[PDB]
Amino acid sequence: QVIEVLNKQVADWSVLFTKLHNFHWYVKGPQFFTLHEKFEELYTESATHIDEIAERILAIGGKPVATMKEYLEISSIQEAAYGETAEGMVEAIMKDYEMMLVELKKGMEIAQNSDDEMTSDLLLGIYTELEKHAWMLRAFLN
Amino acid sequence: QVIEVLNKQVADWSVLFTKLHNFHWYVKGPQFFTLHEKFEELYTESATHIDEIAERILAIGGKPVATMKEYLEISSIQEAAYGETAEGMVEAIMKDYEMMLVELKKGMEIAQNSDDEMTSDLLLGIYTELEKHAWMLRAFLN
Amino acid sequence: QVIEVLNKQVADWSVLFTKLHNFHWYVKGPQFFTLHEKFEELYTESATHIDEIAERILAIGGKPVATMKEYLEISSIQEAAYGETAEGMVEAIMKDYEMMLVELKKGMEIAQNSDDEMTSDLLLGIYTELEKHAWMLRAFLN
Amino acid sequence: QVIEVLNKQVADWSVLFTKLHNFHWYVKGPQFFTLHEKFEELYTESATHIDEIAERILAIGGKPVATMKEYLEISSIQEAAYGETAEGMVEAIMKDYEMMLVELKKGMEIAQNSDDEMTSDLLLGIYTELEKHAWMLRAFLN
Amino acid sequence: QVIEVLNKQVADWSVLFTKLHNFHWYVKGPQFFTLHEKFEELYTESATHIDEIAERILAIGGKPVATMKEYLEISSIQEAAYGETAEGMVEAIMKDYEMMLVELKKGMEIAQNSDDEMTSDLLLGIYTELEKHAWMLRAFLN
Amino acid sequence: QVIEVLNKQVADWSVLFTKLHNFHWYVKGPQFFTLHEKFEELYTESATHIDEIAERILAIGGKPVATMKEYLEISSIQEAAYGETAEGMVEAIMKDYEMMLVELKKGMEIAQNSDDEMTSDLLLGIYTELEKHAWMLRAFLN
Amino acid sequence: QVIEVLNKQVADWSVLFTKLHNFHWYVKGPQFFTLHEKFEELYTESATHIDEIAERILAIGGKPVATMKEYLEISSIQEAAYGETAEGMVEAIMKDYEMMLVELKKGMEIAQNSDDEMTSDLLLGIYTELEKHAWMLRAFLN
Amino acid sequence: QVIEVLNKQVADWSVLFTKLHNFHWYVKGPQFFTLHEKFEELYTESATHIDEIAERILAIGGKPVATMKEYLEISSIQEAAYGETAEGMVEAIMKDYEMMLVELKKGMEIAQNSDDEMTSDLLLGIYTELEKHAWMLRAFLN
Amino acid sequence: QVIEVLNKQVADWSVLFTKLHNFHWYVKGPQFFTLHEKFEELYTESATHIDEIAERILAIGGKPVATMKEYLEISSIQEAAYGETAEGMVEAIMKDYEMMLVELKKGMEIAQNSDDEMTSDLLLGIYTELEKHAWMLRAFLN
Amino acid sequence: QVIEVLNKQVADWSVLFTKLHNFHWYVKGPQFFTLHEKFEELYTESATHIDEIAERILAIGGKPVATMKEYLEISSIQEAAYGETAEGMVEAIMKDYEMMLVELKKGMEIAQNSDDEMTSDLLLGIYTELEKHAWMLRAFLN
Amino acid sequence: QVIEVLNKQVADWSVLFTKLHNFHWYVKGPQFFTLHEKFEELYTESATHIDEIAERILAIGGKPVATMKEYLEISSIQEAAYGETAEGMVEAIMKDYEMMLVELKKGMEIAQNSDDEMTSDLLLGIYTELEKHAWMLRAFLN
Amino acid sequence: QVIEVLNKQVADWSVLFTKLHNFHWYVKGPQFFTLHEKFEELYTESATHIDEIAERILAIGGKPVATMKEYLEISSIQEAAYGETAEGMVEAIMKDYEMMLVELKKGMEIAQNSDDEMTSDLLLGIYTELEKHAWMLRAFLN
Ligand SMILES: [Fe+3]
Ligand SMILES: [Fe+3]
Ligand SMILES: [Fe+3]
Ligand SMILES: [Fe+3]
Ligand SMILES: [Fe+3]
């Protein structure tokens, strides 16, 4: 179902939320201030997705996963490991975003196949959002 | 340590964050709109605590817990079981808040004993905050 | 005199101010939040009237009553009444407003008769204000 | 033509506009304030659609229907009947929204078939909007 | 009754609302932008009147007409015929406003006669509003 | 005519505008700052009246006087002899306001007699405005 | 009890509210404007305290006094005899504030003794507030 | 003296103020709205100049002219001229602005010669302002 | 590639940016103010497109053209020729927009064919934007 | 050098900053509130100058003095002896401002002579600023 | 002519606008975010200059260059070559700004010589602006 | 006395104010912009403390030190130190903050001992503030 695509999104984003807080809290170096900031911007966005998506499946008669327990057993995002570097962190969520772009494309496919371009449009937005981030994060590194 | 009091706070608040979203998403009845709203207000506040507290222990040389995994193994808050009632939900977090008031009083005790009224002050604020909520939540029911 | 009409208004509104706070503080039930709010809106309005009217008689050479003592001995609004219901409270100030509409019409009569449509206009405004409230309050009940 | 899909939207929304005012004005009960409010929110949105859609067909060389007379002979929304209940009203427009989701899907079909995903995108938005409302309205009831 | 004066106002304004949208949508010429704008300003105002008036009669125990059907059988405003001119449109609603000034004066008469200067005051405001418009609209032409 | 009452208002206010600037510029003493300010507040208000009134007579088919020349030959306000005192200035415009209250009452009389309570309402507002000022100005002195 | 300390605060502040309005209305002299203003600032603050405190005792299971009648029989603030001086008024509430500082210190003592530094913190704030005012009020005089 | 240059500015601007109101009030045609607006923008600007300049000479020990009487006997700006065209009006103040540019250049000359580039700078600003207007006004015509 | 579609957009928009400034600067007539304004609105929008598009191709691994030199050798928009009329200018960019709608449709085709509805969505937006403008610009003329 | 003129400005303003705080803190009398305020306004302005000037010399390759030590050995402003009068304070900084006008004129001379009208322009602004203050301060006294 | 100085400014700024976008888009490294931002700030400012200057010459009877074609054949700014470094870019526009300071000084010379300190003042501002930037840009490097 | 603790705070903060400006002005490197900014944020905060503390001792009958002269002879903060590194500066005030935490703890001790938890609370706030900064500053380095 599409509800499953969405529910995995919920789980993933929920993980990102915490993971971004971690990086928000543990980042260090001459890029502290700028990165401390960026991550808060990112988890704020993550929180937005969590509610929209949930309310989306909620709008299509689905039941959104709503326990960290479930999130953990369904999310494919690997939580923080600590000790990460400032660059490590940027590198880390950047990969996370990219690995999510694929799951999204797949998600729009099935959404469209289940005659639900509405949900597809929602997903398309997130896709556009992350793609821009990936570029800036990448440019920060490369 | 005080860091432990704070880190349990972080874990508890993190759980509340998700639990409040759950109620935000699953609430029903003629109190929908007003309760759908209130819960969002509450998880927004919860998110504030998560960062202040974390950054507090972070300011006192501690290392904030930052994985849902840890949160789950340390929080004392019961993750939402489904199918609750609108009143059930209100009743539910109301109890959660009250059970937290006690842990807070204890938390200020030790904070003060460890010569740290700063952290105690932080905790005192949350206490005041929840007490008001408990009253309003309670008055909503009783 | 017109000053007497106005001074009774002052007294009445002053009582309403406190009475609305009481209801603001003691209301209970599933209408808590919405009614807790409405009453604050109402006593805020009441406070507005208290100053305009006072400053009105003050603008027409009068001397505004300014002690709770006098208010009590001149206001015709009940007050107190502790164990009141949420509906009881709505029902209560709704009647208070209606009983004030009459005193207002009378007040505009004498204001006009004393060649003071200015004060009449001021009173007319309050009249319009209360009439709308009465309707909403009433619709809330009926 | 697509212009016809849009023009029916215009008519429908125009009806909703008035119908929502009716409910805005005639609603009663302990849900007054909250529902009095919600309906105004809804007719404000309806008014938005009326202008966008009109200006859309206007942008694609069409001529928007612009008389209540025509609206009445083309809209499929059944105007108010009075006597409705607070729940009745919520139940009423909720059904109206759902019956409009179908007409929209159909509308996007033909839009796409006439090589106009632009108009389809416009319609898709309204679809998403109503779907969320339907859920909240529904949750209010069920 | 006064309720009848008001209800005709509601009907008239409701018609103006649509008629102003029509002109908003169909206007053309070097005065497009400025007139496209002005009409939107005007139908926004019209919508304000619709609700105030309705809520007025609603505040005086009346029942506001709330169907386009009734509006059509009671309004005295001519629904826009198409093909008008930019000047034609300005000329058109300008006359509409003037024809309304008379009905208003009459309306205040009866309002006053029925001991209701409140409603008269409401009507007086609209009068003042339209008179200014008529002048500007007129000056635009003459 | 009523146009004559209004046109005298225009002239008077126009004079006040300049006279208030004079006091704004020439005031001195320990009340400088507070009075320097108050006068600017007053001439700003004066400017408001000049336009409303003008546009009022303009709305009732009249032709507003629009030359300082005419203003001078029709206004009854005493231009500012120079060298006044801070108290003198306050005392000065206070008298001007009071002398205008009378002309206003007269103005509303004729407005009403000419079946124009609209203009009367406009004038009524100014009356209310000045009466308050007079009190504050007076209290400043007495 | 602490509830009694708070309830006396409520009563005192309620009296201050009216007493400050009195001074707001009856003040005179070259300090009119500045003092007319200051008092309004003060009674606005007073109103804030009335609600916080009430809602505080309300949060700790207490029942806030809510009738002017009770206020009068419990407040220790001297209602305003009439005819005071501008300086008299400043001198008057300044003393009132100082006499309240003592009751507050006492209030924090018992709050702390009853293991309620929360309420103590609330009271501490008011203390800080008044102390600053006292200085400015004093400096205004001395 | 420089005070004389400035005082003529004051007088001129004062005249412009009224003259712009006249045009604001008597303009007509298809350019009504846009010109009705522009003139108000212009007299608002004029009022700004009147106070800055006055306060400028006031800052350099001068005494600003402050009576319409003096303004009339010193200003070089025409005034009156009733039956003027929309274009006539634009053409009219445009010439007024240009004739002021010359007086300004002269004014900066003497200001500089009297070792007062401060006043010169002030004047320079107005110059720049008017030059832009002249262009737009001109482009409106040509 | 899609990058080529986007890069031509960049070039085109960059040209429009300058061309719109030209019209912004050289426009004349009784439509000056309104058209002077509109063009600034348009080049502001153009600038928006330039950055979004660039950053879009930048997000899809492309390299955005970034020299006026390249813009000139790739854009299909014909720069201004001066001497244009107010109507000429409106007529001019109106055609430019329409000629761009076609290039856009083509652009979405290839975007979709290269499995990139993201970019297609971006382009779709611009399409909708221009279509509305074309209508208003057209209505201004016809 | 010009850097020396600027650096003396920095020192002077730095002294003013503290001196204005002193007056802000020690002022007394019936002018307390208004003067308490004015001084804060002034030291806020002073702080602005300190940074602009510093950053100015910083922009012209200079090195801004940045220690209170240096400020003291170079500033020509008389630190505040204690116990001044309210009028004394006003009189005090007023003289300080005037004594600075001269140093500024001199400063613009050398700035211009060193082919740096940029810095001169900066200084010119401060000059204009202080001149206005001097007048108001003076008018407050005289 | 002065028009020529200004028109070269227009051309130069126009080039800077694009060149700054280039750097905005192609910058990379740990300074990405901060520099990506700064450049946008800079091209925003550049765009401001383009219009002010153009409108300046437009105000002095000149005809502003308005084609990228002309810009290219008259600007002295080197269009970005690709592959620069983050530092390279900063170094690059920093030099551009400095090379512009000289052309500006020359520009004010001739402006002054042609009796046009107005335009000189305009140019002086830009000078001040760039000088500050150069310092910050420089400090970023050195 | 407590006044002495506070007065040292005043002196210290006053020094910090200047010292932070120095760093604000002399910082260099790839961290320029971000550090140039941070320091301004810090001295703005410092200025806040200077006034609160002063006004605090002022509220407790004390007399705040108010001359740079005294500041210098009582502050324990270094100052000067010209050729400092970007990191050096961060390292520098970070140590300053930490050395202030100790003086603050001591300060709260004596405040509490002198029965003044009010002042203690004020100090507690600053403590919390600095502790957070120290962490961020530290994380920036380590
Ligand atoms: Fe939500
Ligand atoms: Fe944070
Ligand atoms: Fe008041
Ligand atoms: Fe529209
Ligand atoms: Fe309504």
Ligand SMILES: [Fe+3]
């Ligand atoms: Fe006007």
Ligand SMILES: [Fe+3]
């Ligand atoms: Fe409350």
Ligand SMILES: [Fe+3]
């Ligand atoms: Fe002024």
Ligand SMILES: [Fe+3]
């Ligand atoms: Fe960008």
Ligand SMILES: [Fe+3]
């Ligand atoms: Fe700075």
Ligand SMILES: [Fe+3]
């Ligand atoms: Fe422009």
Ligand SMILES: [Fe+3]
């Ligand atoms: Fe202060």
